[PDB]
Design a protein around this motif. Structure first.
Motif, PDB file in Angstrom:
ATOM      1  N   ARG A 386     -82.550-124.941 -37.021  1.00 27.52           N
ATOM      2  CA  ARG A 386     -83.078-123.585 -36.878  1.00 27.52           C
ATOM      3  C   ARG A 386     -82.307-122.813 -35.815  1.00 27.52           C
ATOM      4  O   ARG A 386     -82.005-121.626 -35.994  1.00 27.52           O
ATOM      5  CB  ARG A 386     -84.572-123.610 -36.545  1.00 27.52           C
ATOM      6  N   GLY A 387     -81.954-123.487 -34.715  1.00 28.62           N
ATOM      7  CA  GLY A 387     -81.196-122.838 -33.656  1.00 28.62           C
ATOM      8  C   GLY A 387     -79.841-122.329 -34.110  1.00 28.62           C
ATOM      9  O   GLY A 387     -79.401-121.256 -33.692  1.00 28.62           O
ATOM     10  N   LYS A 388     -79.151-123.099 -34.948  1.00 29.42           N
ATOM     11  CA  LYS A 388     -77.883-122.624 -35.495  1.00 29.42           C
ATOM     12  C   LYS A 388     -78.088-121.372 -36.334  1.00 29.42           C
ATOM     13  O   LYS A 388     -77.246-120.462 -36.329  1.00 29.42           O
ATOM     14  CB  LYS A 388     -77.219-123.722 -36.325  1.00 29.42           C
ATOM     15  N   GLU A 389     -79.204-121.307 -37.058  1.00 24.51           N
ATOM     16  CA  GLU A 389     -79.531-120.102 -37.811  1.00 24.51           C
ATOM     17  C   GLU A 389     -79.759-118.916 -36.877  1.00 24.51           C
ATOM     18  O   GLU A 389     -79.256-117.810 -37.118  1.00 24.51           O
ATOM     19  CB  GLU A 389     -80.772-120.345 -38.668  1.00 24.51           C
ATOM     20  N   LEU A 390     -80.534-119.124 -35.808  1.00 26.43           N
ATOM     21  CA  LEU A 390     -80.806-118.022 -34.884  1.00 26.43           C
ATOM     22  C   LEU A 390     -79.522-117.510 -34.252  1.00 26.43           C
ATOM     23  O   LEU A 390     -79.375-116.302 -34.017  1.00 26.43           O
ATOM     24  CB  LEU A 390     -81.782-118.459 -33.791  1.00 26.43           C
ATOM     25  N   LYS A 391     -78.583-118.415 -33.965  1.00 24.94           N
ATOM     26  CA  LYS A 391     -77.310-118.012 -33.375  1.00 24.94           C
ATOM     27  C   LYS A 391     -76.481-117.204 -34.364  1.00 24.94           C
ATOM     28  O   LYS A 391     -75.908-116.167 -34.009  1.00 24.94           O
ATOM     29  CB  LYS A 391     -76.533-119.245 -32.896  1.00 24.94           C
ATOM     30  N   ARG A 392     -76.398-117.668 -35.613  1.00 21.70           N
ATOM     31  CA  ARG A 392     -75.691-116.898 -36.628  1.00 21.70           C
ATOM     32  C   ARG A 392     -76.303-115.512 -36.788  1.00 21.70           C
ATOM     33  O   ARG A 392     -75.581-114.518 -36.920  1.00 21.70           O
ATOM     34  CB  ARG A 392     -75.720-117.629 -37.965  1.00 21.70           C
ATOM     35  N   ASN A 393     -77.631-115.429 -36.781  1.00 20.78           N
ATOM     36  CA  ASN A 393     -78.282-114.127 -36.922  1.00 20.78           C
ATOM     37  C   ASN A 393     -77.954-113.231 -35.737  1.00 20.78           C
ATOM     38  O   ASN A 393     -77.750-112.017 -35.896  1.00 20.78           O
ATOM     39  CB  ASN A 393     -79.792-114.320 -37.045  1.00 20.78           C
ATOM     40  N   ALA A 394     -77.893-113.817 -34.537  1.00 23.00           N
ATOM     41  CA  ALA A 394     -77.581-113.033 -33.351  1.00 23.00           C
ATOM     42  C   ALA A 394     -76.157-112.500 -33.419  1.00 23.00           C
ATOM     43  O   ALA A 394     -75.899-111.355 -33.038  1.00 23.00           O
ATOM     44  CB  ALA A 394     -77.809-113.882 -32.094  1.00 23.00           C
ATOM     45  N   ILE A 395     -75.226-113.301 -33.941  1.00 26.66           N
ATOM     46  CA  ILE A 395     -73.842-112.851 -34.042  1.00 26.66           C
ATOM     47  C   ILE A 395     -73.714-111.723 -35.053  1.00 26.66           C
ATOM     48  O   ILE A 395     -72.933-110.779 -34.855  1.00 26.66           O
ATOM     49  CB  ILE A 395     -72.927-114.033 -34.393  1.00 26.66           C
ATOM     50  N   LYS A 396     -74.484-111.789 -36.143  1.00 24.61           N
ATOM     51  CA  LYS A 396     -74.508-110.683 -37.098  1.00 24.61           C
ATOM     52  C   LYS A 396     -74.985-109.396 -36.433  1.00 24.61           C
ATOM     53  O   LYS A 396     -74.385-108.333 -36.631  1.00 24.61           O
ATOM     54  CB  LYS A 396     -75.395-111.038 -38.296  1.00 24.61           C
ATOM     55  N   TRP A 397     -76.045-109.471 -35.617  1.00 24.59           N
ATOM     56  CA  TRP A 397     -76.498-108.270 -34.917  1.00 24.59           C
ATOM     57  C   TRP A 397     -75.487-107.803 -33.878  1.00 24.59           C
ATOM     58  O   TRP A 397     -75.343-106.594 -33.661  1.00 24.59           O
ATOM     59  CB  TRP A 397     -77.858-108.516 -34.256  1.00 24.59           C
TER      60      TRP A 397
END
Ligand SMILES: C[C@]12CC[C@H](O)C[C@H]1CC[C@@H]1[C@@H]2CC[C@]2(C)[C@@H](c3ccc(=O)oc3)CC[C@]12O
Ligand SMILES: O=c1ccn([C@@H]2O[C@H](COP(=O)(O)OP(=O)(O)O)[C@@H](O)[C@H]2O)c(=O)[nH]1
Length: 423
Positions: A386-397
């Protein structure tokens, strides 16, 4: 063209307006920043930014306002009206003459001062459109502090802005938030520290009512206050990529000694490196030997840090935050996922948007937030999938925020439109 800027006297209001002022100065505007005596006492560096700083009396400073917010906010308002009027009258004896006053949206009554003095008035909202929308609905009487509001995710009661926490200041605080919209039809410019792609539908709805200008992130001379930059950045430079938990509860929130113990143990029982901002007046609530010894192997405990530079550092894996809007926006724009520990006001709503809309953080669950829950959240972000997902989402933003402030972007265009209107 000479711009006057008047933030509310607290760091989460001063800083985003300062960053906007630095952008405007870079475009050739002269800036005068209006601060209270109390703020100026904390100002340590200002020579480099070339902005004039002019002080007004406190008028009653945040610690005194807490003692009785209904009375002391009204006293602060009366003195600010009188003293900004006197200051502007003095500024009118100097060239270049002031043309516009950008003021914190929490002081809508400064519009009257701007117009009485022949200046344009620009209200600067330091909260996102999604949360500001709630305040507008409060003023309209649609809501009073499961909850449905136009263009917002369905909210639980705990996701609404927290005013019950203030106890005998609760009603006074709720009225000042709603008052931000009390004269919005008379404002010459309405500025929001957000960017369109972050909240498309609510910005579009807001724009259907008033011409608004989304100009955020205003964050990029970047600090006025002591940030301990050398000590902080040398310690971060010793850390490998994606290994540091940055921990800060902002400029105002204070945790009880009981709550500080759980945070301290949780950081120690994780085996992560951590940089924890514990303000000087809060140090005496840390466990006995925490700052001097037990934090030394993996931690840096500091009374203030250069938060923009910290969030930009590749060592920082995640940000345990109180979810103030500046910290939220600065983390998102930096690509840093979050552990949400909101305390009061808009922090509760920001935490819901972080977790459930933007999907760049996880929320702690209150029992006091016990150390096991904090440790679980750290594991979710640093280790779990889940943390890797949150990081990818943060990079998109981060990428969308970079788009917004670069040429052709929505925030760049809006700052250009505001600047050209003044010219
Ligand atoms: C009641 C209060 C609790 C935290 C700290 O001890 C200081 C206390 C008095 C000041 C009060 C804060 C609460 C946030 C503010 C309304 C917050 C604010 C101000 C204007 C606005 O529009 O939105 C938030 C800034 C600080 C604040 O005004
Ligand atoms: O060690 C710190 C902690 C915070 N900040 C800055 O202080 C502001 C905190 O504002 P926020 O809206 O997050 O919360 P508040 O202090 O208003 O509750 C932001 O500009 C942060 O960048 C900082 O420069 N150094």
């Amino acid at each position: 063209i000479h711009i006057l800027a008047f933030p509310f006297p607290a760091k989460g209001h001063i800083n985003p307006l300062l960053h906007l002022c630095n952008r405007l100065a870079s475009k050739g505007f002269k800036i005068t920043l209006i601060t209270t005596v109390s703020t100026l006492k904390s100002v340590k560096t200002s020579k480099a930014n070339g902005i004039d700083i002019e002080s007004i009396p406190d008028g009653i400073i945040i610690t005194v306002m807490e003692m009785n917010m209904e009375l002391y906010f009204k006293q602060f308002k009366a003195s600010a009206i009188e003293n900004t009027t006197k200051l502007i009258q003095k500024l009118k004896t100097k060239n270049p003459l002031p043309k516009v006053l950008i003021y914190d949206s929490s002081m809508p009554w400064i519009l009257e001062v701007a117009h009485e003095q022949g200046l344009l008035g620009a209200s600067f909202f330091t909260q996102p459109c999604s949360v500001s929308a709630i305040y507008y609905h409060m003023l309209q009487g649609t809501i009073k502090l499961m909850v449905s509001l136009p263009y917002l995710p369905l909210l639980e009661i705990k996701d609404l802005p927290g005013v019950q926490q203030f106890e005998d200041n609760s009603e006074a605080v709720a009225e000042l938030l709603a008052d931000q919209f009390s004269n919005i039809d008379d404002v010459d410019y309405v500025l929001f520290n957000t960017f369109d792609a972050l909240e498309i539908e609510v910005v579009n709805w807001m724009g259907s009512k008033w011409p608004i200008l989304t100009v955020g992130p205003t964050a990029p001379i970047n600090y006025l206050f002591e940030t301990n930059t050398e000590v902080c950045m040398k310690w971060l430079d010793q850390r490998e990529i994606d290994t540091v938990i940055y921990v800060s509860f902002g400029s105002l929130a204070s945790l009880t000694e009981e709550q500080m113990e759980q945070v301290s143990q949780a950081l120690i029982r994780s085996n992560c490196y951590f940089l924890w901002v514990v303000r000087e007046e809060e140090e005496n609530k840390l466990p006995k030997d925490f700052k001097e010894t037990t934090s030394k192997k993996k931690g840096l405990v500091i009374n203030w840090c250069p938060q923009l530079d910290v969030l930009a550092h590749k060592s920082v894996a995640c940000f345990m935050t109180h979810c103030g809007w500046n910290s939220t926006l600065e983390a998102l724009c930096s690509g840093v996922p979050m552990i949400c520990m909101p305390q009061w006001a808009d922090q509760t709503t920001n935490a819901k948007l972080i977790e459930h809309v933007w999907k760049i953080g996880v929320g702690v669950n209150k029992s006091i937030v016990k150390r096991e829950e904090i440790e679980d959240c750290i594991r979710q972000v640093i280790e779990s999938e889940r943390g890797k997902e949150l990081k990818r989402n943060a990079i998109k933003w981060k990428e969308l925020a970079k788009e917004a402030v670069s040429e052709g972007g929505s925030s760049c265009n809006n700052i250009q439109e505001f600047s050209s209107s003044l010219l």
